[PDB]
Design a protein around this ligand. Structure first.
Ligand SMILES: Nc1ncnc2c1ncn2[C@H]1C[C@H](O)[C@@H](CO)O1
Ligand SMILES: Nc1ncnc2c1ncn2[C@H]1C[C@H](O)[C@@H](CO)O1
Ligand SMILES: Nc1ncnc2c1ncn2[C@H]1C[C@H](O)[C@@H](CO)O1
Ligand SMILES: Nc1ncnc2c1ncn2[C@H]1C[C@H](O)[C@@H](CO)O1
Ligand SMILES: Nc1ncnc2c1ncn2[C@H]1C[C@H](O)[C@@H](CO)O1
Ligand SMILES: Nc1ncnc2c1ncn2[C@H]1C[C@H](O)[C@@H](CO)O1
Ligand code: MET
Ligand code: MET
Ligand code: MET
Ligand code: MET
Ligand SMILES: [Cl-]
Ligand SMILES: [Cl-]
Lengths: 291, 291, 291, 291, 291, 291
């Protein structure tokens, strides 16, 4: 039972995704293709990264992540295929996913295949890796790749060979670390007792607000649950709430909750109401926090 | 081949759903996860109800409906898991789904697992139930549920245990009826020969308009096909048309059809054109019909 | 493990699709359903055709394409079921899809099932057909089809019987060619050295612009890679770029690329930026190319 | 203290209008300039005509109407200057305007000055004219008119000379009737008892709906106050109300009133609420009335 | 030199206003018509009131305010004409308007003429009045008023007779106080040290935010300039700033200023930036303040 | 008959402007107040400059230009009052405004009064100045200026004193040149034969596009009428057209005209259609022209 978990920016409006899916079933008859999502902001590798980094602990070992936004499509660049190290505990407290105590996932048990454009930055940082390869072998990519559709040609297709048991180290030469392109994570700065970060995303469809201010960033300025926090978005909209586990802790429908999202990050929202949408709060706006 | 049919408000923009799907495949290797939809109006239990109520007759016996919007996530609340009684004929005339005479579905053959927040109201109304359970066992929910992601923790995960043959009655104690939270259906009033109801939905992507005025509500005011109806949306926009089986019965492209939707309810549309969109007609307006 | 590739206009907002999916699994237990996409512009047969015509080469032989937009739902019209001839090479160069030299696909290896409203126009013209049939048998459609939901009753349901091995020629009587409804493809005109066509689509979610000016139309005005082209949308926005394989060939981010899309068509876009969205360029504007 | 009543499409966003105003005061020191409005849809002569045709009765005799939208600016075309015949009674009943029995206005008492593009169509047809002239004299237009600003140069400037007592017949040679450009008024058709017309305008800022169905058109289908009318916009929105003098006659706030607007035309609206705005009703939709 | 100051909801899109203006110059040849504004929210008497209440001290004595929104147009209701008592000091500090020490304005020196619908509520409250009259005399209103245009017929027209020296007390019988319709001012409540009020308007075109929390409301909870204030709009967006005279006091471009607007009311804004528009802050949203 | 020509960003939605106008009539009974416009982009000094610079040649000698956006309101800053030198020919060829040969305007005949924030930059550039003064005297500004309404207090009021014959040099001390705040004009660069500039404005309500590429900038690259120009907005949308006097020169409705606007600058539009609006072209984009 092989599984390819598919993430791209191909959208949900035409047959793009299906074409990849057609190819995946054609290469690996028994595959289950799990859509991650296909609707990220085109070419936004940083956004992409957020969608792919938290996956491994949820999927059965041997799962293959075909993760792609490919602005460099049709160029000589080639995909990188890495087998990640730890599945890594994640979440508001840092645990294994699943029922009971969660499902402990053995190391070396997932492979990502992605453009070598930085998409895998956070994956590599949070999970580490055992081995990394340039996807150049004509046994796993087309001999005449479609100039514009490298998401299909240099990702989908070879994700399928990988799902189908094609040995990882045969896709092309090993890549040294400096050859795996990285992007720079926007850093969280401890100026004063405060923590400056950014709204790193809007949590659709609810309009919850997500900052890049991680738990660890918080537990080092003191801040843990119960703590009365002042959170300031866009530099002008301040907000006050205690840090709480969840939304209903805010009290009435509409009230502000400051909480840690399911990825471990300081977030803000309204209890059973959208905070972002009425106020057009958006990704890229700054975000300060202090108790 | 166990099937989990998945309905949520998780959206289609991040890895939320896939996280759930990963866990599903991990708990129940053989599962086929069928998306119902994941783009309901967040926290709108009434809306969600409408997407899950008519499913059972279309799915193979033994299907599990993982259905969730969970405003109460992170609280002490626990999901309910019911096995429904009748699959229940549905539709504009009330029939079994499928080719020929349709496929009759044995009683007691589907289980719903949902927040105990009322999402299951109309399900229980239309289908009745054999047994209902508080989803509390550590064998089918996390010991450390992610505060904010109870859709994953108290729904996805346990739906997978259930698909996997985990005995329903072992998820937690039996729930008495009064403990199964219900919402109140907004009622249709026979004031005069008229029927006041409500636009209960816009039928996306077509812009057809659906009222909570069910057939039985109509065949007790007399009205059946052929009948010349006056329908009045928002209290201001009147409409005249015979009740007809379908859209093309309206005649020319753009003409008004008053008809009965595939769920059995009084609806209005334009023949091969959108009624709702040019006029900004919404889920929530007043609907009124007369002869 | 046969496969139904499903394309419709039913949207991703309600349980419509899943109802069809439910029936599919019910009729053909072992089916894998592949979503093509379900968010075509309602009733736009020409658009739908675009989404279905290039699929055969991608899917394993025996794949069944349930392709539907059905404004004539509820009428006496009956769907057509064709087995296509050639899987037909496609793309910017005209190749088999897949790794290596691609996967050659035997003829007579795919069935399309659709409303007889013209959706399969391009299919039939680019792939040809071996045999065509009116879908009338009670063995594959309901005895009381839901008047408004012929996508489900006259497509999904029977697509499932055909996936399940139901002999194609037993769905209903053979249709003669003139009975397969055709729409008229907007033609490309060689007025001068120029080539007048149309923006056939906006390529979502990137905002690339696609014309109905096919490569063949190009290679007979001389035009091939390297050529400096003037492309003029809407009649007033001219555009100058050499015809190149891909986006990055435009140079800096934002630069215009004139290139052939993955379907073989002349297209225009910006390198890692949206061309269509900032300027509200929309399908249907004139499009012209010349040396 | 003579008066130039000024109507144009120059907008209220730049100094365009004021430039004309500046010239007006410069040419006719004692002028009072009355803004009619300057935010007509650019180049829409039919709309402009609506704004200028009913003014004469309101202004003191000798008033000069500088009325302009000039797409032909910078060309050899020259404005027409007419002295109108009748000030012409107007309104829902047909009366002189003002207190008491209103202010009867002598004939031959107002001059219009406009592009010879058809703007004065309705003017000439409802008021008649005594004398018409091509505005060609260097005594009233520039010797080097600004190519793009013929509203200023071929209207405002000369309107000022005429306000200042410049003899009308010395602006340029007389024009014969056939040389005064006319546009064709969309006609109201008595098909049955019904009356087919058009939504001629949206009455901003209220959202009332105005048809080109004049009272006279009404009083010959029988229709006068008290009559129960069916009015049908866009072909599908029917509407039922008695024809009444005013809005409050509809009863409660929000209720539909069918009434005659202040220009004599059949109109529809909501009592102290907008009819057109919530439903995006727009000028140009069909409009029909009957008993 | 008589002046009529004109305020209505007639908009700036057609000849409505001009028709009134035509009539005004016709009744009172020497009048100067000063537009106040014509773009208030139709029928919003409370909004209207805010536009008319602060005027008297700016205009030369004898000025006449023609102030109208007239939902009751065409009914038997009649306008009220009042001569107000004091011109009343206004502003952030409460002073006479003008150069030097300002222009002291004698009592009994302004008349308002308005629908008797409550438009004059705040005028009457802030300025008091000497005498009040029903405008019924056929010497100052038409004998056949246009049903729909009472703004013109029962306001403009008789504002002009009043400007023209027609004795106030001749317009119709005196009205006792209980006959002058009043609306209820939304009250500011001292719950705790805090002051609950409302955003009473958005200050266009800047997007400054205006509350109904008057200076006096502030100087009674202590609050005066310098004071560190917490201001909470919509119940969720808190804000902190010192109360300062003006915008630049906020410091950097973009910073929040809490200040008293030119009408005396607690306001909030961004220094040289819009506060309302990016966040879609709107009239009707609550507004708390506390130091 | 003294004229105050008024330009501000006060908008047209409240009584702001009228407050100013009231004071104007109160200080200078005989004044005619001419609105320039009041809807400029708040605080956008560059924009405002463009609305006030070309006025003088259109107004009678002695006219006073009250021109204001005042971000610094409430601060110690004080307005500047200058008497300009030349009225300065303007336009697409450079002429006096008016009928015949136009009306020559004597030097030293207009005064501008404005915030000393740079609003007057291009005025002083194009017109030069004879004398400049700090507006400080209590005789022409309030002793207690309203902190927030310096447009009224330090502009409207004193413009009225000036219209009223109050000696310019008595408003406050003479200002040396370096004390008259200037902004920097964004410059046009002759890189190659090309001219890079900027869309300096959208010409509302037509959607014509105005560049800061002045005629003289063009007649030194050679370019005069007849010349075939390539113009490139936003760096992406190219355009080809002869330089022509006017719009109709483009030929058919909708065709592109490249021409020189009434202020002398290079502009682009569609003949009797909007260029800017369908394409969302904005004040601020890059403009580039070549041959
Ligand atoms: N106009 C474009 N500029 C830059 N990159 C683009 C463009 N269009 C598509 N892409 C990329 C992203 C897809 O994942 C990928 C599919 O191979 O193609
Ligand atoms: N702002 C919110 N307030 C209250 N509850 C919220 C909020 N956002 C998401 N949720 C809930 C509902 C999801 O279905 C559910 C999935 O765990 O999470
Ligand atoms: N308003 C309408 N007029 C005509 N046809 C409509 C309408 N809405 C849906 N449809 C059709 C097309 C879907 O594919 C189809 C699903 O069976 O339903
Ligand atoms: N793009 C354009 N095409 C054709 N005509 C236009 C355009 N813009 C303005 N106008 C005209 C009409 C104004 O009344 C007039 C003012 O003289 O300028
Ligand atoms: N549809 C309407 N419902 C209620 N009131 C309306 C409507 N249209 C106009 N008005 C009012 C307000 C104007 O000031 C006034 C002009 O006399 O007419
Ligand atoms: N938010 C603001 N920040 C800074 N200044 C502002 C603001 N709003 C108005 N103004 C100024 C500019 C007006 O022209 C001027 C009229 O007094 O008031
Ligand atoms: C708490 S909402 C559950 C889905 C959400 N997007 C998340 O990952 O946390
Ligand atoms: C153009 S890159 C992404 C694939 C594209 N939507 C296609 O159909 O080719
Ligand atoms: C309809 S009430 C306001 C006047 C309206 N705009 C008219 O033209 O009559
Ligand atoms: C401070 S902005 C000046 C105009 C504003 N609308 C007011 O009355 O205060
Ligand atoms: Cl991040
Ligand atoms: Cl108020």
């Amino acid at each position: 039972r092989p599984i390819i978990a598919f993430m791209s920016d191909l959208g949900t409006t035409d047959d793009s995704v299906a074409q990849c899916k057609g190819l995946m079933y054609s290469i690996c008859p028994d595959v289950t293709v799990v859509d991650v999502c296909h609707s990220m902001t085109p070419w936004d590798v940083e956004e992409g990264a957020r969608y792919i980094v938290d996956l491994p602990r949820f999927f059965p070992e041997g799962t293959v992540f075909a993760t792609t936004t490919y602005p460099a499509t049709g160029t000589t660049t080639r995909s990188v295929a890495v087998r990640i190290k730890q599945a890594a505990k994640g979440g508001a407290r840092g645990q294994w996913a699943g029922s009971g105590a969660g499902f402990e996932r053995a190391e070396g048990s997932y492979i990502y295949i992605a453009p070598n454009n930085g998409l895998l930055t956070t994956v590599l940082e949070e999970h580490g890796y055992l081995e990394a390869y340039e996807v150049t072998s004509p046994k796993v990519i087309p001999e005449q790749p479609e100039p514009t559709f490298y998401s299909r040609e240099m990702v989908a297709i070879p994700s399928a060979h990988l799902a189908a048991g094609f040995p990882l180290s045969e896709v092309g030469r090993p890549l040294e670390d400096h050859e795996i392109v990285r992007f720079n994570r926007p850093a969280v700065e401890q100026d004063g007792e405060a923590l400056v970060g950014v709204v790193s995303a809007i949590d659709h469809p609810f309009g919850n607000v997500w900052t890049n201010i991680h738990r660890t960033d918080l537990e080092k300025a003191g801040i843990g649950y119960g703590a009365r926090l002042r959170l300031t978005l866009d530099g002008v909209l301040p907000f006050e709430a205690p840090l709480t586990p969840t939304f209903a802790d805010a009290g009435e429908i509409g009230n502000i909750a400051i909480y840690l999202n399911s990825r471990g990050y300081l977030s803000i929202a309204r209890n059973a109401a959208s905070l972002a949408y009425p106020y057009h709060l958006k990704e890229g706006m700054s975000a300060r926090v202090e108790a």
